[PDB]
Design an enzyme around this catalytic site. Structure first.
Site, PDB file in Angstrom:
ATOM      1  CB  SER A  13      -0.985   0.410   0.993  1.00 23.32           C
ATOM      2  OG  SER A  13      -1.687  -1.223   1.143  1.00 23.32           O
ATOM      3  CE  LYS A  43      -4.709   1.557  -0.522  1.00 23.51           C
ATOM      4  NZ  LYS A  43      -3.679   0.000  -0.921  1.00 23.51           N
ATOM      5  CB  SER A  71      -4.883   1.221   3.854  1.00 22.52           C
ATOM      6  OG  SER A  71      -4.406   0.587   3.127  1.00 22.52           O
ATOM      7  NE  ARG A  95       2.067  -0.818   9.964  1.00 18.68           N
ATOM      8  CZ  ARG A  95       0.932  -1.164   8.700  1.00 18.68           C
ATOM      9  NH1 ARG A  95       1.161  -1.242   7.418  1.00 18.68           N
ATOM     10  NH2 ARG A  95      -0.213  -0.559   9.708  1.00 18.68           N
TER      11      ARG A  95
HETATM   12  C1  LIG Z   1      -4.218 -10.195   7.946  1.00 16.76           C
HETATM   13  O1  LIG Z   1      -4.902  -9.248   7.225  1.00 16.76           O
HETATM   14  C2  LIG Z   1      -4.564  -8.213   6.747  1.00 16.76           C
HETATM   15  C3  LIG Z   1      -4.646  -7.711   5.733  1.00 16.76           C
HETATM   16  C4  LIG Z   1      -5.426  -5.817   5.422  1.00 16.76           C
HETATM   17  C5  LIG Z   1      -4.880  -5.508   7.052  1.00 16.76           C
HETATM   18  C6  LIG Z   1      -5.018  -3.546   6.539  1.00 16.76           C
HETATM   19  C7  LIG Z   1      -6.204  -3.193   6.055  1.00 16.76           C
HETATM   20  C8  LIG Z   1      -6.333  -1.309   6.094  1.00 16.76           C
HETATM   21  C9  LIG Z   1      -5.281  -0.983   6.668  1.00 16.76           C
HETATM   22  C10 LIG Z   1      -4.414  -1.086   7.409  1.00 16.76           C
HETATM   23  C11 LIG Z   1      -3.238  -0.573   8.146  1.00 16.76           C
HETATM   24  O2  LIG Z   1      -1.626  -0.594   7.564  1.00 16.76           O
HETATM   25  O3  LIG Z   1      -3.235   0.315   8.730  1.00 16.76           O
HETATM   26  C12 LIG Z   1      -4.547  -2.833   7.145  1.00 16.76           C
HETATM   27  C13 LIG Z   1      -4.435  -5.686   8.203  1.00 16.76           C
HETATM   28  C14 LIG Z   1      -4.698  -7.615   7.813  1.00 16.76           C
END
Ligand SMILES: COc1ccc(-c2cccc(C(=O)O)c2)cc1
Ligand SMILES: [Cl-]
EC number: 3.5.2.6
Length: 242
Positions: A47, A50, A95, A227
């Site tokens: 991501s 983006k 995201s 992170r």
């Molecule tokens: C275990 O699979 C997943 C898939 C997508 C996310 C996700 C989706 C949207 C934002 C974020 C983030 O960075 O805060 C993380 C998490 C876990």
């Protein structure tokens, strides 16, 4: 010009993890990292893509401005915040992959490839699906290459309009207080091994800017908060933020 500070490794080992933080002092034109080789190791951007995806969509008119509403397509996905209408600001904030996949399809392979070469972005390889190559295709970028790209964005030197670059930097706004402003984007790469987390952006101070790019091994979603937390501990250690 580059200096390695292994003491930062403690910030990753405390969480039984492994990763890299890369910092660039813009005023001094000096870089710092805990691991010079991993700083140059190329991974899927996930991501963090983006940022360039947004720039291209804006400059081609796929996205008119930061207010245009992209309606939920009605498919319930596992991320609740994805199951609603979004604009560019909120799509970045949460995201929202499916919104950016629609961007990518409208951009198309030919224009996507041309723009990433124009950006000198990573390995400039979009092999795979036009709407998923940054999650499970052939594109790769290193932390130092992320900083190189971000420095161009900050200075409005990318080969898109100034307006496009200003809007994306607005959309990157993550934190702001009396001490600093962070513009940044997270990434979480899970579809191809090794699973990693990203955080790339910069910290604006009164009289300097510190660009940063970090990634870390991410076997589970439980560690996603590291992170930002690890990056901020390094910034605190180096007296960049209080
Ligand atoms: C275990 O699979 C997943 C898939 C997508 C996310 C996700 C989706 C949207 C934002 C974020 C983030 O960075 O805060 C993380 C998490 C876990
Ligand atoms: Cl702003």
């Amino acid at each position: 010009e580059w200096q390695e500070n292994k003491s930062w490794n403690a910030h990753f080992t405390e969480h039984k993890s492994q990763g890299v933080v890369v910092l660039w002092n813009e005023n001094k034109q000096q870089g710092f990292t805990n691991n010079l080789k991993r700083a140059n190791q190329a991974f899927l951007p996930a991501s963090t893509f983006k940022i360039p995806n947004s720039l291209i969509a804006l400059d081609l008119g796929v996205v008119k401005d930061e207010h245009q509403v992209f309606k939920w397509d009605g498919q319930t996905r596992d991320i609740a915040t994805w199951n609603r209408d979004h604009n560019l600001i909120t799509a970045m904030k949460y995201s929202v992959v499916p919104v950016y996949q629609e961007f990518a399809r409208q951009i198309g392979e030919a224009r996507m490839s041309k723009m990433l070469h124009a950006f000198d972005y990573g390995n400039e390889d979009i092999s795979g699906n036009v709407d998923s190559f940054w999650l499970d295709g052939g594109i790769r970028i290193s932390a130092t290459e992320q900083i190189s790209f971000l420095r161009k964005l900050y200075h409005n030197k990318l080969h898109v309009s100034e307006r496009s670059q200003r809007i994306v930097k607005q959309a990157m706004l993550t934190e702001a207080n009396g001490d600093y402003i962070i513009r940044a984007k997270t990434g979480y790469s899970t579809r191809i091994e090794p699973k990693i987390g990203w955080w790339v952006g910069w910290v604006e101070l009164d009289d300097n800017v510190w660009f940063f790019a970090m990634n870390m091994d991410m076997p589970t979603s439980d560690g996603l908060g590291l992170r930002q937390a690890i990056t901020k501990e390094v910034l605190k250690q180096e007296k960049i933020i209080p």
